[PDB]
Amino acid sequence: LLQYMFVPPGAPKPESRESLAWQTATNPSVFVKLTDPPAQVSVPFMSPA
Amino acid sequence: DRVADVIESSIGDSVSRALTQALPAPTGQNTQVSSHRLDTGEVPALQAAEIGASSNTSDESMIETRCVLNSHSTAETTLDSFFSRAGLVGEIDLPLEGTTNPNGYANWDIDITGYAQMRRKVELFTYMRFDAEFTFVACTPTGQVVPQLLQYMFVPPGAPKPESRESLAWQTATNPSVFVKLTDPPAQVSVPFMSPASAYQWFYDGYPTFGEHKQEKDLEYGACPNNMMGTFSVRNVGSSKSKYPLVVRIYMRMKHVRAWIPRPMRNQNYLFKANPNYAGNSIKPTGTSRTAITTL
Amino acid sequence: EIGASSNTSDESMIETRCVLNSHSTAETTLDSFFSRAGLVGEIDLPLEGTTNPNGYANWDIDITGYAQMRRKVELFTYMRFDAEFTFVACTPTGQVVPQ
Amino acid sequence: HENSNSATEGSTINYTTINYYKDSYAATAGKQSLKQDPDKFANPVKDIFTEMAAPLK
Amino acid sequence: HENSNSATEGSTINYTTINYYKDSYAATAGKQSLKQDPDKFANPVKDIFTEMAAPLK
Amino acid sequence: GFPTEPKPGTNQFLTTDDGVSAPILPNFHPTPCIHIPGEVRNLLELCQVETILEVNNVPTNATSLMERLRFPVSAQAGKGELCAVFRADPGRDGPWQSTMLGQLCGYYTQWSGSLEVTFMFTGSFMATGKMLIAYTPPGGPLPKDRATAMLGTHVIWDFGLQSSVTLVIPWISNTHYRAHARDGVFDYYTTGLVSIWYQTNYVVPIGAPNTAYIIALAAAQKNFTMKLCKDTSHILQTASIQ
Amino acid sequence: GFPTEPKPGTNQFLTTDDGVSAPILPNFHPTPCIHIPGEVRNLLELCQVETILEVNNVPTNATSLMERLRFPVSAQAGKGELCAVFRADPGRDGPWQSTMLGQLCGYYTQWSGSLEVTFMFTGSFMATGKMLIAYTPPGGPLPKDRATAMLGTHVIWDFGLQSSVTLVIPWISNTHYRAHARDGVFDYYTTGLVSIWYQTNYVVPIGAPNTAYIIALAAAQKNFTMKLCKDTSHILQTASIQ
Amino acid sequence: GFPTEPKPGTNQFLTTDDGVSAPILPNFHPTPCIHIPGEVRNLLELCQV
Amino acid sequence: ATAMLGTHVIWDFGLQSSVTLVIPWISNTHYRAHARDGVFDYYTTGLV
Amino acid sequence: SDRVAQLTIGNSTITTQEAANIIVGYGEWPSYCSDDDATAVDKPTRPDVSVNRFYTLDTKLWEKSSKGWYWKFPDVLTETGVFGQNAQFHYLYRSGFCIHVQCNASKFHQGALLVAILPEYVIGTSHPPYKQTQPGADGFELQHPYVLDAGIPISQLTVCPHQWINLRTNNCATIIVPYMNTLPFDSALNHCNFGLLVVPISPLDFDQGATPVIPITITLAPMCSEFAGLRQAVTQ
Numbered sequence A: 001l002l003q004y005m006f007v008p009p010g011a012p013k014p015e016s017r018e019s020l021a022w023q024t025a026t027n028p029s030v031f032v033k034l035t036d037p038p039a040q041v042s043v044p045f046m047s048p049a
Numbered sequence B: 001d002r003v004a005d006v007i008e009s010s011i012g013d014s015v016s017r018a019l020t021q022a023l024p025a026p027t028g029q030n031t032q033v034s035s036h037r038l039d040t041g042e043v044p045a046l047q048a049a050e051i052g053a054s055s056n057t058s059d060e061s062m063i064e065t066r067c068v069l070n071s072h073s074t075a076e077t078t079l080d081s082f083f084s085r086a087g088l089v090g091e092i093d094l095p096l097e098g099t100t101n102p103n104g105y106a107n108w109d110i111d112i113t114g115y116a117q118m119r120r121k122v123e124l125f126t127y128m129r130f131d132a133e134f135t136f137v138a139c140t141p142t143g144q145v146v147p148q149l150l151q152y153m154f155v156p157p158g159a160p161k162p163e164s165r166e167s168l169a170w171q172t173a174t175n176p177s178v179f180v181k182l183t184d185p186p187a188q189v190s191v192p193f194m195s196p197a198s199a200y201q202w203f204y205d206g207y208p209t210f211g212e213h214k215q216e217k218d219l220e221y222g223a224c225p226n227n228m229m230g231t232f233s234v235r236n237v238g239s240s241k242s243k244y245p246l247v248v249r250i251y252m253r254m255k256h257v258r259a260w261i262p263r264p265m266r267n268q269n270y271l272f273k274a275n276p277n278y279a280g281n282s283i284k285p286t287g288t289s290r291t292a293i294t295t296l
Numbered sequence C: 001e002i003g004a005s006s007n008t009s010d011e012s013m014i015e016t017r018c019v020l021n022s023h024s025t026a027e028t029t030l031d032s033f034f035s036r037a038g039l040v041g042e043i044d045l046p047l048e049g050t051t052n053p054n055g056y057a058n059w060d061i062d063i064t065g066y067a068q069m070r071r072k073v074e075l076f077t078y079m080r081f082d083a084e085f086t087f088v089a090c091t092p093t094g095q096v097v098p099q
Numbered sequence D, E: 001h002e003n004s005n006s007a008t009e010g011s012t013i014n015y016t017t018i019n020y021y022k023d024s025y026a027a028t029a030g031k032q033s034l035k036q037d038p039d040k041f042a043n044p045v046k047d048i049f050t051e052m053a054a055p056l057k
Numbered sequence F, G: 001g002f003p004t005e006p007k008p009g010t011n012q013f014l015t016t017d018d019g020v021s022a023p024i025l026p027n028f029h030p031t032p033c034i035h036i037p038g039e040v041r042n043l044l045e046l047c048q049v050e051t052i053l054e055v056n057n058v059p060t061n062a063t064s065l066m067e068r069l070r071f072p073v074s075a076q077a078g079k080g081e082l083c084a085v086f087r088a089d090p091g092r093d094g095p096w097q098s099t100m101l102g103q104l105c106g107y108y109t110q111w112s113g114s115l116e117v118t119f120m121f122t123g124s125f126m127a128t129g130k131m132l133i134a135y136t137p138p139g140g141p142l143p144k145d146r147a148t149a150m151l152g153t154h155v156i157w158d159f160g161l162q163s164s165v166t167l168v169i170p171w172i173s174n175t176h177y178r179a180h181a182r183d184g185v186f187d188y189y190t191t192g193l194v195s196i197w198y199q200t201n202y203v204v205p206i207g208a209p210n211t212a213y214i215i216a217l218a219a220a221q222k223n224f225t226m227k228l229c230k231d232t233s234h235i236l237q238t239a240s241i242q
Numbered sequence H: 001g002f003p004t005e006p007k008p009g010t011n012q013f014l015t016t017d018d019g020v021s022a023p024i025l026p027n028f029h030p031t032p033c034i035h036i037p038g039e040v041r042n043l044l045e046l047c048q049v
Numbered sequence I: 001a002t003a004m005l006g007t008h009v010i011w012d013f014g015l016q017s018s019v020t021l022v023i024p025w026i027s028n029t030h031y032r033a034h035a036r037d038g039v040f041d042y043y044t045t046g047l048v
Numbered sequence J: 001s002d003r004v005a006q007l008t009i010g011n012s013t014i015t016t017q018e019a020a021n022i023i024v025g026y027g028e029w030p031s032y033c034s035d036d037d038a039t040a041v042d043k044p045t046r047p048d049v050s051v052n053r054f055y056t057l058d059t060k061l062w063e064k065s066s067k068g069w070y071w072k073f074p075d076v077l078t079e080t081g082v083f084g085q086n087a088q089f090h091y092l093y094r095s096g097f098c099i100h101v102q103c104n105a106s107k108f109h110q111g112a113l114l115v116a117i118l119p120e121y122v123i124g125t126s127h128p129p130y131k132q133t134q135p136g137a138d139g140f141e142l143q144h145p146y147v148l149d150a151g152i153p154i155s156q157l158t159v160c161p162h163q164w165i166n167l168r169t170n171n172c173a174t175i176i177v178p179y180m181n182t183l184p185f186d187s188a189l190n191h192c193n194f195g196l197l198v199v200p201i202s203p204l205d206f207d208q209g210a211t212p213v214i215p216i217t218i219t220l221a222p223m224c225s226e227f228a229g230l231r232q233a234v235t236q
């Protein structure tokens, strides 16, 4: 089992396999098993420009 | 027949004065053209925060501004758009060896003040009414997906709490239970706003006992029964040993949020659960410090 | 002594005020109550033992075998209804087997 | 037909959600209406002055 | 078109359920109507008195 | 096939989930439903019915378990005697255990509404008297004086043809609903206390029992409503069903 | 059955996915929602409120942590003294850490809008003066002269009945939105700098404090808007909750 | 539940498959699209050059 | 703290040097006789 | 016509000549309970004038070193005046308040006092005593004003009904707050809806010679007082 977490620029980046940052209370995270099909994700145009 | 005093007396107005109306605001305010202005009696900049009001001075009255059409939406800065995000709030451990959770079962107390991330955000307001969606991530201390079966049972306050891996309480004839394999995806659950109080209370400035409040009983100051949702029980569905070292992580997301009174953010490191106690022996500044207020 | 529950109302007892009871009584209904899954049966097909060898088992259809459920149901004398049964098969440990 | 039990019940805001079950609280958070009131916290003063005017008369 | 075989058949209460199969009993319990009659058990007396009146005349 | 994307909860089994399931008997038809007396629609229809309240629940001789239902009332002599006291919480392990209403509450987590409790005098017809039945709202400690008890919601009762008399406990709470009170902290949902005192005295002629009994019946008012639910904690099976 | 064909993402669990889930309590009804004062609708309602800005954040004695809120302003003598300087970035680890607005930004990645910062003089009433508060737009290095600082957006302030005075930082950027500036490269989103100089001098009569203080309050303008979001980097828990 | 019968291709991941996917940022709004010179619509616009 | 339990009025100093306190006729009788200690205090208007 | 002001409630009247106006908590006036928000089935008591009046209780001395003080409204008033009685005799309580913290000085003095309101004011320290959580009259004092003894930054307290008493301008603050709680009524004997904090952000200073006795008095007044659940008299 794994956990993919997106860390926007300015957000706390995980420092260890058990860093507090993985609580992902705000950031968007996805948990998946290698037995389940690949992760499907949609991402909007995010940029100051 | 009337003393007149009874006729005048407004006593009994369930209607609040208000004096402040909520208006639509999809796009941030759009700036408008502004030319120079030199006159007496008009002091936009000059204010007096001594009153307790945030300066109402606008850009235009400060500098010769241009015109701008703010298309920037403010839909992501809303309650739901904010709180409605899954986050770690619970974590149970059912190991094979140890003193923590032997026997194969575990009764977790329903409280989310156990984790920073989530606790920080929520403690921003004083009251909060809402529904939630909980997800359950069960796995071994390594990340190993095991073919084990479990049973999550909700135990409302006042209901029989399981005492053993095979306690009668697991028949769950009334209580709501969920059976899942660690091979199947996490559990999806919707939970309605359940509480005698119209809204959950983050801070309770009082005692729930109404007694003497002796020193040994100061363990109650701040404890609000309106936030007591009972407990959460989990165990392996069997008569023998689990055969596997398991660890369940509870995640929560809020739906239909309704926050009220706002308070200052957290300044210190949390120490206890449901306790605003802080590190008194070593307090740190709200933010970063410099070498001189005249140097960057 | 007549066999009737006192019909006395709060108003005639104390100077009451006015209250708008919004409290719904939809969860205190029959379906809203009984319509909740519960343990009523339990079969054992072990490898060793005298209980269920041979590999098969004939269970008698009766739910009076478990407290929790039996308590609620025995509240009434008669009862008409449909039901939905769920079957949880597993080994005495919680082991999920490809059987 | 569905039940009316979703916290934000009788709420002034209009939420357009999706629900497959009988209870409305199981429904998603969905799209909502954008209203604001910076004054209840910024200018909760009894009397109002305006920028052009001097706060203390 | 479906069958009419769900216990609460010809029932006075109006149940709004969801069913995917031919038999109506496979349908969910769904939302129902809220009716009551505390009298059939509380005041199953032949004659009625009222609070203001004395039970035994 | 059709593009699908199963979300969390897939293959999970929820105890209290209202869903459909394949029929086992295609075209089956249940035996016609004959008309049967006293049918029930809602549980609150029962909470209206008064059931014997075991105030005098001290005895447990197993030979004296029947006197738990009754109540003692002798011919005192002093002014302001205390006759009985008990919790005002229905779903509590107190005397409200006997009452039907009480047992039902064990299946629900919270409630709301006023409560009625009628008292019937069984003593001889010649037996006269007057008593003050008080109800001390939450926060008020058990009164020690018949004078300190009458400061709350009370009601004087006289004996005669109308043996019975009902005391209504007005739902006086800070919260819309109350959770079953249980001592530590969870007393924040206590409904208060109920005391009984001698307004005058158990007057009796020459030739009638010098001691009589009273029976308490409890029930809920119309404004009563329960919410949520759970397994009862009022009873637990020790041995497995044979 | 019905022809389906599950696509990628099946059985996956997304933290920020808005979806449905089976109800745990069929026919449950939440306690009525009473009316409660000061309810909030949007977070930008808070960014409007001014909070104390810790410019003088140098002291950390733990006994002198309270003077981080105030600000020193003595009776200088020379022409063109510099009183204070600080970053113009809200979500930066600078002085904007104290401000409510600042703490909120930590939960968002980008922003937009002008910013207001009112300064209130606390010194004696007899204390007079005039000062130039400047704002050097991005690209402009910290000015060294009160004459080099006034080349940007500034505002002279006089002392009197109107103790306070607000300086508005007009959103002057090359991009519609700005990312929280943090030194290396990510300074491309710096909002500039803010300097304070003595236009004249802290004039005081004979008998009044020879040194006074000022308090800075910061907030965002109406044209302010945040986008995206994330976990705060302004604070991190060292030890686990007990 | 509803009678379904997954057909071949289930859980498969096609590189060039146009489908939907759960959003990572509920209620997100991309920075306004300013007008920029020489925008392209079709590749055949280049083959002309 | 024991004096403010009755009819009072806080006064601040400034341009408006003066300030007036009104003693509301609070009596049990329509008219009052001049109070003079012994018994005839039944007509006392109180204290300030 | 904005600095001068007068407050008249019950049989009490307040004056000022340097006021900085009045602030209404979250822009809402104290209202009574609706017949739908209440669950307490019994007509409460609205004594009005007898309780809804101004009460001048405690006073403190501002110094060049003072840290700050705080009070717990629901409890503070109890034990005093007709109000206290209803609060002790009745179980359920409901009311809004009008607070007036006055503190004058001369034009040669300097100082800035922050006076704000904080709902459900809980404190930390591993558990504070009853003499610290409910210091009714004479209140209590802050030891760590920077974190409000709760672990929260004071630099962010302005996000609540507040006001300033900058000696160089005004000499008193005034706030009005409506009942606040997730319930219609609630016993004030054991629960305080909120608290008042008075902290010097700008250290009181003045050249020697000028009267160093700078008192800070507290005066409050209940509004729309409603009490229910009449019973025996209780204290805590």
Ligand SMILES: CCCCCCCCCCCC(=O)O
Pocket (backbone or CB within 6 Å): B110, B111, B112, B113, B191, B200, B201, B202, B222, B223, B224, B227, B228, B229, B274
């Ligand atoms: C069924 C989920 C309900 C979630 C409610 C969580 C409330 C926890 C707050 C604990 C605060 C406290 O106990 O003082």
Ligand SMILES: [Ca+2]
Pocket (backbone or CB within 6 Å): F205, F206, F207, F208, F209, F210
């Ligand atoms: Ca005899």
Ligand SMILES: [Ca+2]
Pocket (backbone or CB within 6 Å): G205, G206, G207, G208, G209, G210, J207
């Ligand atoms: Ca001097």
Ligand SMILES: [Ca+2]
Pocket (backbone or CB within 6 Å): F004, F006, G004, G006, H004, H006
């Ligand atoms: Ca499928």
Ligand SMILES: [Ca+2]
Pocket (backbone or CB within 6 Å): J058, J059, J138
């Ligand atoms: Ca004192």
Ligand SMILES: [Ca+2]
Pocket (backbone or CB within 6 Å): J075, J078, J134, J136, J236
């Ligand atoms: Ca006290």
